[PDB]
Write a protein that holds these residues in place. Sequence first.
Motif, PDB file in Angstrom:
ATOM      1  N   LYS A  13       0.280   7.094  -6.282  1.00 12.50           N
ATOM      2  CA  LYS A  13      -0.887   7.941  -6.494  1.00 12.50           C
ATOM      3  C   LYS A  13      -0.544   9.390  -6.181  1.00 12.50           C
ATOM      4  O   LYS A  13      -1.000  10.307  -6.861  1.00 12.50           O
ATOM      5  CB  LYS A  13      -2.063   7.475  -5.633  1.00 12.50           C
ATOM      6  N   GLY A  14       0.274   9.585  -5.152  1.00 13.12           N
ATOM      7  CA  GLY A  14       0.705  10.911  -4.748  1.00 13.12           C
ATOM      8  C   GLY A  14       1.502  11.630  -5.820  1.00 13.12           C
ATOM      9  O   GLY A  14       1.369  12.838  -5.992  1.00 13.12           O
ATOM     10  N   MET A  52       0.837  -1.187   0.000  1.00 13.59           N
ATOM     11  CA  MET A  52       0.000   0.000   0.000  1.00 13.59           C
ATOM     12  C   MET A  52       0.879   1.247   0.000  1.00 13.59           C
ATOM     13  O   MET A  52       0.505   2.281  -0.562  1.00 13.59           O
ATOM     14  CB  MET A  52      -0.932  -0.013   1.199  1.00 13.59           C
ATOM     15  N   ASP A  53       2.051   1.139   0.623  1.00 12.72           N
ATOM     16  CA  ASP A  53       2.986   2.257   0.672  1.00 12.72           C
ATOM     17  C   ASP A  53       3.476   2.610  -0.731  1.00 12.72           C
ATOM     18  O   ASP A  53       3.742   3.773  -1.020  1.00 12.72           O
ATOM     19  CB  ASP A  53       4.166   1.934   1.588  1.00 12.72           C
ATOM     20  N   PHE A 109       1.577   2.031  -3.408  1.00  8.34           N
ATOM     21  CA  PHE A 109       0.365   2.513  -4.059  1.00  8.34           C
ATOM     22  C   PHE A 109       0.108   3.983  -3.741  1.00  8.34           C
ATOM     23  O   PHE A 109      -0.017   4.809  -4.647  1.00  8.34           O
ATOM     24  CB  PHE A 109      -0.836   1.667  -3.635  1.00  8.34           C
ATOM     25  N   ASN A 110       0.032   4.298  -2.450  1.00  8.92           N
ATOM     26  CA  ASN A 110      -0.229   5.659  -1.994  1.00  8.92           C
ATOM     27  C   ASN A 110       0.807   6.651  -2.512  1.00  8.92           C
ATOM     28  O   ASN A 110       0.470   7.768  -2.907  1.00  8.92           O
ATOM     29  CB  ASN A 110      -0.273   5.712  -0.465  1.00  8.92           C
ATOM     30  N   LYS A 111       2.067   6.233  -2.511  1.00  9.93           N
ATOM     31  CA  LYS A 111       3.147   7.087  -2.976  1.00  9.93           C
ATOM     32  C   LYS A 111       3.096   7.271  -4.489  1.00  9.93           C
ATOM     33  O   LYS A 111       3.416   8.346  -4.999  1.00  9.93           O
ATOM     34  CB  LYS A 111       4.498   6.516  -2.548  1.00  9.93           C
ATOM     35  N   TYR A 125       9.176   7.509  -3.627  1.00  6.55           N
ATOM     36  CA  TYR A 125       8.539   6.380  -4.289  1.00  6.55           C
ATOM     37  C   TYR A 125       9.560   5.343  -4.754  1.00  6.55           C
ATOM     38  O   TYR A 125       9.364   4.145  -4.559  1.00  6.55           O
ATOM     39  CB  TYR A 125       7.705   6.884  -5.467  1.00  6.55           C
TER      40      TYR A 125
END
Lengths: 275, 275
Positions: free
Chosen positions: B135-136, B128-129, B131-133, B195
């Motif tokens: 997306k960021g 998820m880390d 993914f979130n990064k 990322y």
Amino acid sequence: HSYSYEACFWDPNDNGVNILLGHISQGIRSCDSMILFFKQRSELEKDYARRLGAITGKLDKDIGTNMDYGKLNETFNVVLSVEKARAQSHSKQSEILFRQIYTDTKAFAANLQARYTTLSGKIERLRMDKFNKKKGCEVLQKKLQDAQIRFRDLQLNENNMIGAKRVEHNKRELLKWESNSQEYKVQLDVLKQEYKASQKFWIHEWAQLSCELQEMENARISFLQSKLQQFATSSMETYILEQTKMDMLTNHLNSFTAADEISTFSKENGTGRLK
Amino acid sequence: HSYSYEACFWDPNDNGVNILLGHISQGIRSCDSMILFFKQRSELEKDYARRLGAITGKLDKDIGTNMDYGKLNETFNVVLSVEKARAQSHSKQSEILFRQIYTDTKAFAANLQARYTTLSGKIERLRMDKFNKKKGCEVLQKKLQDAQIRFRDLQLNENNMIGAKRVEHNKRELLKWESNSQEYKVQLDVLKQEYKASQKFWIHEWAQLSCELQEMENARISFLQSKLQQFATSSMETYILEQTKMDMLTNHLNSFTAADEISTFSKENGTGRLK
């Protein structure tokens, strides 16, 4: 010397008779020990097979539902097949027990009882013939002695008779009991010979009927003897089978290692290496 | 080449991850197949031993009540002793099944599940880390392009300004979105590097956690593998014993004949011969 039923049971009070009749009779009831055992044992194996089958049933559905991989899955199915083989083996063992050895033993025991009942009746009837005839002799021997005594009394009395009616009356009694003494003596001699004949017939018969008894017991021992191997063989076949099936399971548990399962799984489902 | 979990499951969409997590998880539930089997099988042997004991119980009382003679009586007691030996053997087998292999397998399965739950959580948190990064980055790339576009629009607009308040207002907007473009660019460069760091950390971690998984499955296969021999050995010991006991019964059924029983009985209880 040489020992058997017709050789060694000759007593002047027919003791050996009741001893043999007692022995054969108790041996017949003794069959009920094994008859009941065979039945209950049969009923036990049926429930074992049926309940084991139900267990392998839940195992089959579980293997399919909870899928597993490779050798560990093929080993779950060996366990499944091994156990349903035992189930069938115990089930087959159960059926052999109920019909071939339980049924045939109960039926045979009932037939021994039937023959024994007939034999004992024939025995009792014969030795009563010796009893009644012996009692008959003693009875008449009393009558003979009585008649002989009343005769001697009457002739000793002959001189004390006064009247012509008194004399005649005593002379009549004299011949009446002379006649009685003579007939009783003859009736006793013949009944004596009837008794010695009956003694001879019993010896003739008991020589044969003790053999019939010895044949009964011999047929009882041997039948139970063979039925117990048929028992020990049917059971043996299961145990020897169950060993072979656990050999299978052992042989395949040792056919693979966990390292093999990881190697093959990665071969089939690997999503690519790292560079 | 060389095939394992940490070697062969590297996909750019983390496909190999869910494949391995799926495999280990289904293998844990697959244990319930054997856990239940071991339990039911254990419960089966206990009832078999207990009911067999009850059967040999009625057999013992029957032998004593319905007395029998010589070898056929000593053979009734061999049957009695053989069968209570099996009863004890199945009873002992039952206890081994319930506690040493059923209990230890259920307990071990619950522990695999506990470790798996922890692992999966750690996995999910890590990817998820990424993914979130990721997306960021895309989010800010939009913001950067937007800010860059509004800047170019404002400077193209600079010549159409009439008033002094209109000119100043546009010059303010110009620098505001000049500033925004500059900061967004920097905020994007750093988040880009965060990322790539997170990508590098996942590779570092997954190289280790896939090994943890491969250790889990290996410990699962091997444990079940050993528990199934312990099963096949405990059962084997019974079947080998049961064979030896039926050997005993066979060996003594063949040790005597019915002729022997008649000979000896007449020796002990004969009431005299005939002359």
